[PDB]
Structures are given as C-alpha cells and as structure tokens.
Design a protein around this ligand. Structure first.
Ligand SMILES: [Mn+2]
Ligand SMILES: [Mn+2]
Lengths: 285, 285
C-alpha cells in the first residue's frame, strides 16, 4: 500500500500496519449477568478464532441516570472485579484477549489493576472528557469509537490521547440501533485513514456480517461486532449480535478479503508475466 | 469524503467525483465477429442498465505479430468501420454508450471519425507510446488500464496525458486470465487514488462479480467487466465474462454498495439522533 498505519505492537498484540485485521467479539451485556454464560461466550469466541472478547464495566445509575427503565434493564448484567478476574483467566487459558469498556473512572482503575492492556471507550463517551483523560493517562492501549461525533468532536478526543502519546486506535461507528445499510457511511474509514496516522477500524451495529466485511474491503484494520452464543435467549442486544458460527465466518471472510486487497503496491503480479512478455515483445513502440 | 477525484463530464454522464460508479460491459471479442450477436449484446447490456458497452478495434496481424495461432483466433472477430457504425447506432437507440479499444492509430482515427467520445487503451499498450500520444492528442476521454505495469511505467503513461490536459481515467487491472482472487491487489485502487487526482477504477478479469463489487467497496469509481450473452457458446474470453443477468446484478449491487459507502463526511447520521441526545444530557462530564 501507499498508506500504512503506524502499527501498535504490545507483545503478541500487533494491530495496524500490515498486520491481520484485529477482530473483537463484543459480548457487551448479552450474558445478562450470568457468569457461566459469559465464560461460555469466551470459550466459543476463542473457538471461532476471534482475536479478542470485550465486556462492559459500568454502574447502571451512573450510566443512565434518571432513565429508570434502562437502569433496571442493565442492572442484572453488572460484573465486578471478582467476575472480570475469572473472565480474564478463562480468556488467557483459551488464548483470546480479554478487555472491557469502562464507563467511569472507578471501573477504568479496576480494569488497569487487574492487568488489562487495552481499554475500549464507547461512542457515547467521545465527549466524556474526564473519562478520556483518565484513559489517556493510564498508558494503556485505547480504542475509541466515534459514533455520534462530528469532525471537531473527534479531533478534540484524539488530541487528548496525542498529548499523552497513548497507543491509540479509532473505530468508525454509527450509533443507530439497528444500523441500516444506507447509514453505514463506510467511506468515513478512508476519510479517517487519510486524516490520521494511527490504525482505523470499524464497529458494527448491523444485523449481519456483510457490512463489517465491506468495511474491511473499505480499509478497516479492526472490526468490532456484537456477539451472542444464542440469539434465541433474547439477551441484551441480541438483534445486532452474531452467533459463534457467524463470528467464525466473519473471521475467515475477513482473512479472505484481506488477501484480495493484497499488498497495495504498484507492481505487477507474477501471474501477469506472460502478458508482460507479450507487451515487451510487440507493444513497445 | 476527504479526497474526491476531479470529475469528468461528457453530456449527461459524469465520471468520478461523487457521481455513480460508471459500469462498462466489455464485449471484447466474445461475439466472434457475428454482427447480429454483437447487436444482441448491446440490447441486453442496455436492458441490464450498464452505462456503456465496449468493443475492440484492431488489426490481427499488427496486434499479435508472428504468433500465427493468436492471429487466426482473433481474425474472425475483427470488425471494421461499417460494423462499428451499426453498433454505435444500435447503442444510441438503446440508450447505452458505445466505445471501443483501438489497438493502433488507424483504428483510433476511425473511432474518432465515427464520433466516439471515449477511448479505452488496453493494459498491454501502457508502454505503447505512439498509441498513448495519439490518444492524448485526440481530445477524447481516455480510459487506460494498468495491468502489467510498475509505478514508473504508470507515471510515464500518465505524464503523456497530463501534458495534453486530456480527460483521463486510470483503471487498476491484473493481466491474468482468469485472475485468481488472491492476485486482485484491490488496495492498489486506494494507492492510485492517493497518488493521482483523476478518477480511478477497476477492470476485472475474474470469474465472477464478487471481485468487482469488492473493488467498488475499496474505492473504484469505474468498473469494467467482460460480458457475454451466453458462456456456453464458448466465445473468446467466455470464462471471465458475465451473462446478462449477472451484469444486471453487478449494476444493482454496485449501487447498493455505493449507498453503504456513503458520503464519507465526518458527521453523524440522522438516525444517531437518540444517542446524541443521550450523550449530550448525561455523558458530557
Ligand atoms: Mn456497540
Ligand atoms: Mn480485459
């Protein structure tokens, strides 16, 4: 390629540059607070060969305030340090990366204390200056999604991490539920890749995997997709969540599209040598 | 978007910029020199809503030299001026644009004389300085494919058209028949869009429409696809040619993927309004 993002390398973490697309299974709140179900989600995400599985670390009242129905809905799905330690341990055993989205500073501090190496910051927090500054100060790798955000809002958020030289990844994202095809605006990925030097990816909220695969073809270097072991359980966000076989197809189809994208250099392929020989023998005149 | 190519206009059709993808059905030599078959090809390409149908204007001996097998294969498919006039008349009647690839200056002059407004130059002629200079001096829209070519060979050809200020379009292309998907190097499209200001597209030599559709997702603003009424006739290039229903699907799927790509601006979609209001009321802390 011409454009190559500055890769983020932390041990075996290798994101951007000419590395494989980093695929995140967003378990989110779909486990409903069932710890055994969350552990099962890790097992089956590792079997699907996702690179990482992501959870959410939040206080319901802090997150939703006076929306009593939202509070009651997400209250059962809260996990604390003891559960996140068990989930991190199962993830290490199954060779899949564990991390989570903190929604406040106490949860961020807890995630750093249990040894996570990556933080996700949700789209709704792209203007949460206190939380962004705490993420930048942590020194950890930060993935920020830009759903809801204008170009100026993105620049303000990006500057917070540039100022601390945080390893930083930005995901194009549309905070629409569910996200329709005509709202994907996947060419924003290239707009961001032209504007910034760090890796750009895509976080999906559609009802399938076609849009994230198209996002890979349009340049995404990271893919985040909501994830469930079984939509029939009707857990939180089930409608936009991929089941394990669909996650596995996302992984293998991403690899296939990456092969099709190729090296990006302006040079002939060896499969063209017969036409090169013909060109050189008769058409140079 | 961020970058936009400088659009090219000819009548009511505009190529590049934020115009629809321009779709070319390459009839090639697949008609085998059967004029009635070539006329049917125009009818069915227009019904499929391709923007243009393209033919090839060549002398077999000039094109293939002492390769007597190749000369005998393509000699029956030669059309002359009288045939191209009939093909152009049919295209206008059916509301599809007609043009052709000249392989020598006599055929280029003939095409301009009968009123064609676009010239295609084949990948094998990207080092054919005499032909490229005649195309650049013609004043017509020139579409060039860069199969076989290195960056420096592309730059040499581009410089010819920059000097004459020709309306110019470049197609990424891999001169392999049929082209394996792992050879497609579709990220070369973005490399070319970053290097050059004129519209960049893709000429396909694969066995399906998936690769050209991925090329749209990777930024192609023009798609050329080989075309046949019926692969079972085993005409020249049958294996890489789309049949009319498949051409029609390429057209409608290209429009769908363009809608998914969107405008490329860093501004939220209207459907994100609920999440914006949530963000502004509770998460600006
Ligand atoms: Mn999400
Ligand atoms: Mn061709």
């Amino acid at each position: 390629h011409h454009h190559m993002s500055q890769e983020i390398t932390l041990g075996n973490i290798k994101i951007g540059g000419n590395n494989p697309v980093f695929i995140i299974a967003e378990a989110g709140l779909n486990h409903g607070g069932d710890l055994n179900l969350a552990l099962r989600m890790i097992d089956e995400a590792a079997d699907a060969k996702a690179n990482a599985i992501k959870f959410q670390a939040y206080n319901s009242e802090e997150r939703f305030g006076e929306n009593k129905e939202a509070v009651n809905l997400v209250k059962p799905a809260e996990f604390g340090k003891k559960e996140f330690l068990l989930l991190k341990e199962r993830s290490q055993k199954k060779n899949i990366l564990f991390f989570a989205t903190p929604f406040d500073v106490p949860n961020l501090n807890m995630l750093k204390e249990i040894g996570v190496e990556i933080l996700k910051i949700a789209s709704c927090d792209i203007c949460n200056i206190t939380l962004l500054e705490a993420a930048a100060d942590s020194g950890l790798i930060v993935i920020l999604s830009r759903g809801t955000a204008s170009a100026s809002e993105i620049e303000t958020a990006v500057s917070i991490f540039k100022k601390k030289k945080s390893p930083f990844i930005l995901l194009h994202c549309v905070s629409s539920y569910p996200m329709n095809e005509i709202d994907a605006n996947l060419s924003a990925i290239q707009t961001l890749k032209s504007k910034y030097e760090f890796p750009i990816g895509y976080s999906d909220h559609s009802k399938g995997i076609e849009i994230p695969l198209l996002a890979v073809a349009s340049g995404a270097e990271i893919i985040e997709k909501h994830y469930t072991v079984d939509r029939t359980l009707q857990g939180i966000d089930w409608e936009i969540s991929a089941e394990p076989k669909e996650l596995a197809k996302l992984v293998t189809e991403t690899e296939r599209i990456r092969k099709i994208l190729g090296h990006g250099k302006l040079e002939p392929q060896a499969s063209e040598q017969e036409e090169i020989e013909y060109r050189n023998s008769l058409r140079r005149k």
